[PDB]
Amino acid sequence: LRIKEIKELLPPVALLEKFPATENAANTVAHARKAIHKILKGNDDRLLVVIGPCSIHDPVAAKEYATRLLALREELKDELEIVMRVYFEKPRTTVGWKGLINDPHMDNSFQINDGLRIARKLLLDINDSGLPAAGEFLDMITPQYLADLMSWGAIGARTTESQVHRELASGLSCPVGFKNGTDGTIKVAIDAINAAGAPHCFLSVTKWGHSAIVNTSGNGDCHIILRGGKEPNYSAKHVAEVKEGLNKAGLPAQVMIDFSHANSSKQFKKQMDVCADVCQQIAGGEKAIIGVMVESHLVEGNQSLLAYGKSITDACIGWEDTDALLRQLANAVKARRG
Amino acid sequence: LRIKEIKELLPPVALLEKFPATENAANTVAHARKAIHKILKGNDDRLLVVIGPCSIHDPVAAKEYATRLLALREELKDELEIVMRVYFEKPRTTVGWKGLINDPHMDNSFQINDGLRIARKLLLDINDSGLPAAGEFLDMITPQYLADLMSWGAIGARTTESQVHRELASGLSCPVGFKNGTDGTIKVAIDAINAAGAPHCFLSVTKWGHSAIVNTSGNGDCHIILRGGKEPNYSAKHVAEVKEGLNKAGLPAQVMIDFSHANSSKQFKKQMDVCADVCQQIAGGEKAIIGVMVESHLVEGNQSLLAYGKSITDACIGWEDTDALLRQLANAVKARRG
Amino acid sequence: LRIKEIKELLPPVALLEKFPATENAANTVAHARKAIHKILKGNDDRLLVVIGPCSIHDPVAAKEYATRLLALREELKDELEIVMRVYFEKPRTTVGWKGLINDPHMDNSFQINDGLRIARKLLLDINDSGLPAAGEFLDMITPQYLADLMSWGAIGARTTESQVHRELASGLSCPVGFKNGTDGTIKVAIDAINAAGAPHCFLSVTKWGHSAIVNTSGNGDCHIILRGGKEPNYSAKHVAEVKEGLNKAGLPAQVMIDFSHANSSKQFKKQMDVCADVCQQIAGGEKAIIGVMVESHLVEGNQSLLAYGKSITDACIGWEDTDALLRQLANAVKARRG
Amino acid sequence: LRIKEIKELLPPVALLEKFPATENAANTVAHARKAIHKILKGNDDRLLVVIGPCSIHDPVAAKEYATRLLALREELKDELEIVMRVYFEKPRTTVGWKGLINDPHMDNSFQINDGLRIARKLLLDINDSGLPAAGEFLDMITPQYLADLMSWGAIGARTTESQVHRELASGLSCPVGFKNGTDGTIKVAIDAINAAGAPHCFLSVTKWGHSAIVNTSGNGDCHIILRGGKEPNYSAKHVAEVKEGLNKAGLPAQVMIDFSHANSSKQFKKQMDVCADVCQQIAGGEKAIIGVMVESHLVEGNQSLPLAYGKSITDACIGWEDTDALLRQLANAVKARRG
Ligand SMILES: [Pb+2]
Ligand SMILES: [Pb+2]
Ligand SMILES: [Pb+2]
Ligand SMILES: [Pb+2]
């Protein structure tokens, strides 16, 4: 038996009762979902920008970040639908700290019940300020505690091909983006969109902390996220291949480009050069780039498991580069529209 | 909101009470796990052969195939540890029938509670006759209904990179093998072994159908499964590359070779050609090929979702070649040792 | 804190899966409930006889008794609907052994999970042979494990006035009888019938071992059980007072007379004297004595927690007396009839 | 078959997370339980006074009652340990509104999840201000949502004889009092004290909303509550009868007298007459009357189901002036008993 311990877990209803969505928060989520929805459905020419830390490890810095990006959101609101990256669970290449929910105190105490309280509280506050949130849905149980406060979800490169994750995505209430695979493979994400578009029947855990059988309807609001592979995949020809690829699979030829991870070749400031290309293509009149993803924090760089506004997982651009980038992208959209 | 229905699910304890492991069943499981443990520890020289249908879709044909194989298990137990493939859940490239548990009646009725009863009864019978079983652990909730009757598990190509699956593997009581990824990537499986080797803390569902926090020990008994990519990866060249990679990563250099899927270029009869090559290597002295995987059924080929013992998912070799193969492999094992 | 321990409890569904009602078991229950319905609705002139041990403490002796009583049940079937007392939970005046479910091994080990398995098995066997069962519904959680195999329920003297019990009775699928209170009070039972006749909404535990809100419909098949008080209340005097009382309260004037407990002044053999009196009433034309209750076992008397077919709680008449009594009652029904 | 529907129920942990006991709330509960423990143990000779509405049906009127009673609690805290009656579940003689938790909105809507929220919030507020609470434990599942904020529990006349209730009482953290039975029977309550004094093993629902097997230790802090029967049973005559019966039973000879229900012949006003009799006894040296129970509200009487603000919708209560007066009488009488 390779189970050392079983410890009790507060059900989703405990967290949803202790921290109910406020009316303003319920409204943030609703609008961001239908805004992201029309960006996908043609209807609105703005760019979805999902940006924020690689991981949330500090609610204080999280909130300082939030107020600064909410400011920029209201400014750039006519060009950009800015959603903040509030990533609570992190996929490791082997082992490592898996995010705030799993180990809030960053010493290996795994106080997951606190992790969940802290996480839902923070997510409530940010959404209540009027700023929408985005998260990676990695774990299969935590979605119930958080999904109602999320306006967009990502399925990571390491899990796009997983049927379990494509099943989860077909019953989420928010739009979802599928990262291409670690090696560059586009085909797994394309399949994943088609798979998540269908109804599925599977086993999941209810708001009451009990397993049950779930039938989903399928999620039409899914799109690919170009995130690099063995080499970058943000460029025009790459984008072109993915567009004819997506049209051959029967799906809207529209992409979100992630400036980070393998697209910034692990070189975070390169995120701005990726930005320069994408902005040059947006400004060039490239309709299909529907959204982008960027990893920023208050201070650039990263640490390892302690500084204040700096990432403890992936390296991010800091706030002045963030502001700059966001301005570029908006100007590029402006140019694209007229 | 995108969930169309929630239906109740019998907890693991209902299935474990209606169908407890008999003393014979329990003994099969224990000895098979010990066996594969010595083989992986290197202090036994026999080959692990995980063979059987691609998917179980018919308990009658499955009980038949099991007694036919038990004959060969007993007949070859000094050169080979034969474990039957009792795969109840299947990973689709997009959509399709996901296995017997998910849809036992192969019309889309999703009678998962029956699915689970049928699945646990069949697994009990096969184990009680003295034949061990192997399954793919795809879903996160079904393990509790079945893992005590499983002597080896596989994590599939589409989920080896998934942290959720590596977490599951670190707390399973049986040895586990990690398929390399769909395109050929060896590195994800190597990472997966290292990942699954560590203790993890995560959320899972207990025998009582309730979520809880779980801590694992890490599973020492995990190995890679070479299953092909864009290119076959069974040859002696590939087996050296993979052994060396494992050495860099500080892992025992051992592999299980899967004769099927991308190694047999998806046409089943090529499994005999892979068999020839691998027997050649084993006989020639390759100490590292620790196990193999083959997809066989009573009748060969496959059919689309209906002929008694033919596969309804991947094409398999039929019985004559199966018997032949188990012997090519057994002779090849005698030859590797003196 | 005055809680020494919490230990896990198999959900109703574990017991209902391990021991499903067979088709015979199901038809016993259905037919007996329809029978007692027909008697309480006044369409059939037979007498309901609920007879059997005070408590079940030994499945062997219970099975022996069941065989003997089943025989008498088919012999006497034209005048009597004989239901066996299979009482698994017992109300103590202060402390004592609370029944087989609570402590199956009569040493204070409280192996309630075994208790429940033993109890449901035994109840299944008795019912499957074609003999109906009657139980006291004392505890609020155990009903889910047993009620589908019960053809009549009693609410005890010490709990008739309890709202919790009257709530339980309004949602039971079998007829229910309310004992008058310990002191003789008729009024509490009359109120209890009216209370249980109404819809109630309250909290209970589901087949899955989880609390939920329950709305019941109300149970029209409830009647009083005259069980004595500070003095006996079986005489025709008493039966007229109680019929009139029921008329005032707008209830059908019908009674079940219990020959035991305070009606037999706690010494068992007096049950035959009460039997004589009540047979004399029935024969003389008393249409209202709808049923009776008697405490019998194989061997007469009782012991203290060991002899075989002897009660370990209240003293009972033994099998010889039982056969005689049952013959007396049948003849009296035959006289009443003409 | 006879069940028309099943609806979901928030587990105890949802309520305990949304409304945790504050540090003040926790302190109130602790000291009140310790206090009643020492009265019941004979180390303090103050009188326990459990007083308040028959039923809580209005959190606004209930909070006001609580600030007034809290005021009186601090001025009389030298002779009386005053605990407020916060009764959320009510036993009906046949059918009727079963209390705030069961039907908070008093139209039969049965919004029990709201009922529980409302009930735990109110109980938290009252305790956090520093006023202890008392409830009847009628239902077997609701205890998990409320017992940590309760400083004393009662088991009603209609359930004292029920084993299920005596099992619950043996594992409650607060002292418990057992009403004698509707008809006057003392013996059922005496048995219930002895029964609740022993360890029990039974099935109950955990903080997580799941059934489990529970072993309790037995509750030493239980006492009888004289509440009348076919006749009143408050007189020193009756108190003498009941005192030797508890001794014959092996129990400390101590009683709580309830001035209401069958002791006040169901007309509320009579509670003052009972008060006079019992004060007379206490002053005269009757060391066995350990506590009392009274039903009061802001406004006297009761009313049938807009409502008249602080008035009972179940049993008739004395109103606030009579309450203040009564509490003063009792405190003076406690003074006459120690010399
Ligand atoms: Pb990252
Ligand atoms: Pb396959
Ligand atoms: Pb008895
Ligand atoms: Pb009252």
Swiss-Prot record, chain D:
This protein's pathway: Metabolic intermediate biosynthesis; chorismate biosynthesis; chorismate from D-erythrose 4-phosphate and phosphoenolpyruvate: step 1/7
InterPro entries reported in the protein's UniProt record: Aldolase_TIM, DAHP1/KDSA, DAHP_synth_1
Subunit structure: Homotetramer.
Pfam families noted in UniProt: DAHP_synth_1
The keyword Transferase is assigned to this record: yes
Protein name as it appears in the record: Phospho-2-dehydro-3-deoxyheptonate aldolase, Phe-sensitive
Disulfide bonds: none
GO MF term set: 3-deoxy-7-phosphoheptulonate synthase activity; identical protein binding
Entry keyword Acetylation: yes
Protein purpose: Stereospecific condensation of phosphoenolpyruvate (PEP) and D-erythrose-4-phosphate (E4P) giving rise to 3-deoxy-D-arabino-heptulosonate-7-phosphate (DAHP).
EC number(s) from the headed UniProt entry: 2.5.1.54
GO biological process, one term: amino acid biosynthetic process
Additional record remark: There are 3 DAHP synthases, AroG is feedback-inhibited by Phe. The other 2 DAHP synthases are Tyr- and Trp-sensitive, respectively.
